[PDB]
Every structure is written in C-alpha cells, then in structure tokens.
Fold this sequence. Notes:
By secondary structure, this protein is α/β, with parallel strands linked by helices. The protein has two domains: 1-214, no CATH class; 215-351, no CATH class. The protein is built from seven helices and 15 strands. It has helices spanning 24-38, 51-64, 105-112, 144-149, 159-172, 205-216, 285-288, and strands spanning 6-12, 42-47, 70-82, 85-88, 103-104, 119-128, 133-138, 182-186, 224-227, 233-242, 245-254, 259-267, 302-306, 317-326, 333-340. The strands form three sheets. Strands 1, 2, 3, 4, 5, 6, 7 and 8 form an eight-stranded mixed beta sheet that branches. A four-stranded antiparallel beta sheet has the order 9-10-11-13. Strands 12-14-15 form a three-stranded antiparallel beta sheet, with no helix packed on it. Magnesium ion binds next to strand 5. Residues 11-196 are annotated as: Caspase-like. The active site is at 78, 127. It is found in: Cytoplasm, Perinuclear region; Nucleus. This is Mucosa-associated lymphoid tissue lymphoma translocation protein 1. The PDB classes it as hydrolase.
Amino acid sequence: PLAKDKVALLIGNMNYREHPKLKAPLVDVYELTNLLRQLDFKVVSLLDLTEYEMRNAVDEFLLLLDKGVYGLLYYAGHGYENFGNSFMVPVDAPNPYRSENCLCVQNILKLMQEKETGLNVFLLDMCRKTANIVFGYATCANGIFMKFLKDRLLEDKKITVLLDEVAEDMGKCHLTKGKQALEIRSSLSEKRALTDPIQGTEYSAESLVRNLQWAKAHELPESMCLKFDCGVQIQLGFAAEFSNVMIIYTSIVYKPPEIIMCDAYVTDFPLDLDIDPKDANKGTPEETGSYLVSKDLPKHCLYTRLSSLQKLKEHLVFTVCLSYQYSGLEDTVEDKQEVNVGKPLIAKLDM
Ligand SMILES: COC[C@H]1COCCN1c1c(NC(=O)Nc2ccc(OC)c(Cl)c2)cnc2cc(C)nn12
Ligand SMILES: [Mg+2]
C-alpha cells in the first residue's frame, strides 16, 4: 500500500477571548507534529486560530486531498454538539456560542467524502460544550487522548486496528474507565497505515511547487549579526515552535573591553502581532509562553515569542535597542537599529 503524498493539518485552540483556556493543545499539537514528521508527513501546525483563519486552513488542507493522498486533520480545543452536529470553536467565538461562527464537523466530513484519497484520518480532541475516512472523536502534560495515541502512532498496523487499541488503553485508564470518551467512525475499505511509503517521488510541476511552497511557508530568517558604532555586536537568532509561532532570541556576541554594561532588547513590532512589551525580552523562553522549543534554544539570551504570525500582513520590521555604559562614565548611552526579516513561516502565504 502506497501513498501519493502525506499531508497533515494540526490546529490547537487554547487562548480563547470569551471562553476557558486549555493547556493540553499546546503540548499535544507539538508532539503530534514531530511524530507525524517522523512518518514522512508534510505538516502544518497552527495555534490559536480565529474563525476565518480556521476556514482558510481547512479549505487549503482539503485542496491537497487529491487521488491517492493520505491526509490527516487534527483539532484540539473547544467544541460543542447542537442537534446531532459537532462544531470546532475558534478563539474569537463569542459567549454564548452561535453555530454560524464555528466550523461544523459534519460539513468538513461531507467535503472529505467527495475526495478519492487513499486515507483520510480526522481526529477531534475536543473539550465538549470511497474516501477511506477514519474519524476519531474524543471528549476528554498531555491530554488523555494524545498520551495514549502518541505511544501507538508509530506502530506498523492498520490505523483502525491502531485507534481501536488506543480506545482500549483509554477504557482501562482510571480517569476515563468505563466512560464514553472515544468514538471511532470508519469507512476504510483497505489495509492503510500512517507508516505506508510515498510512491516514487517524481518531477511533476504541480506537486513540486506545492511541496516547495510548503518548504517556503516554513523558512526561518537566517542568523543575524548587528554591529553598533560603539563596537558592540549583537546576534539575533530565530526558532519555530509552530507554523505560526516563531521565537526571537538576542545575545551580545562581542563587547569592547572599555564598555562596562550592554543590554540588547527588541521592540516596535508590527501591531498586527499584538506583542505586549511586558512579555518580550525575557531571560528564559518559559517566561514568554514557550515551553517546548526551550530545551533546543541557546542559553543566556533574551527571548520574545511571536505567536499569531498568520496575522502579519507586512514585512516583519522591528527595532533592536542597545543601552550601554563606558568605563568611568556616569551616563548610559542608547542606540537603535531597524531590522527587516521578511515574512517568516506562514506569513509568506500573504494572508
Ligand atoms: C494550499 O496549501 C498551502 C499549504 C502550503 O503552505 C503552508 C500552508 N499549506 C497548508 C495549509 N494551509 C493553511 O494553513 N493555510 C492558511 C491560510 C490562511 C490562514 O490565516 C488567514 C491560516 Cl492560519 C492558514 C493547511 N494544511 C496543509 C497541510 C500541508 C502539507 N500544507 N498545508
Ligand atoms: Mg461550518
């Protein structure tokens, strides 16, 4: 059994404006991304999406579901049931909910039902109120579903057999023991698995430009070295937590011996990103809201988390500031430099 290609769209909503926050989507989408990438899936991981951003992400994902393709869609966040229908709640939903402002699962399923895909796995991990589709619906540090799913996902068995084993894991767990926490709906008529290889990777112009636009939509700005007149050199580094989340970190690489102190800090970011200056320039990545890529970031820097890159409609332009003092000097001099790192990650798509 072969896949024409393997694409995945992972969405996690946690920072709700009018509803309770959720912690699990953060680690769950992060761990699911690495595992799916290990299975040779091109992944798009998005955190905290409004209604229009979800509708654009899901439509574009469905466009990739050509004949023979293996697709996986995963959602983690608020959801609600309204007369037999299930809805995914965007971070911009009002309180109380209105179905119109949410994404109907049954509408998406109907759209997937028209594809001639090899495998279509749709996972819903919600906090509640042939197309070879395998729908998984969960209604419950990782969340319960991902804790059991992450331990089985790399198994070389049929996805239905694999998800059925997870249902049995969850049924033994003292938390969801004897509870209706997982439903699996399936129309899989053949032996497909998330581990199946991709057919002979060939030079077809249409699939190569979508693979290279996916590569382009995940390009980070390269390392930067800014030199100030005083002789101080600052390095700007960039890391990615999600397709729409980039960390920026600064360090002083060189400081002249005659300079007693030098503090580098970034400010004046485009207002679409809504970066609070009290959350930027922290001594640890955890202080910025970054708890996953923290172990892979270089130490003893100043960190700023840029979430909401899907909202950036212009070039990422910001100021790098430097406060410094010389030997014997009673006054602290201030100097600045403007930086333009293009449109990083998902911002390349022109939102
Ligand atoms: C058409 O495919 C384009 C490809 C290539 O570039 C990366 C994005 N792509 C996508 C998306 N797309 C989106 O998420 N689009 C998006 C648009 C507007 C938005 O905000 C207004 C947001 Cl938040 C998202 C979704 N699933 C997948 C899965 C794969 C393998 N790629 N892929
Ligand atoms: Mg809808």
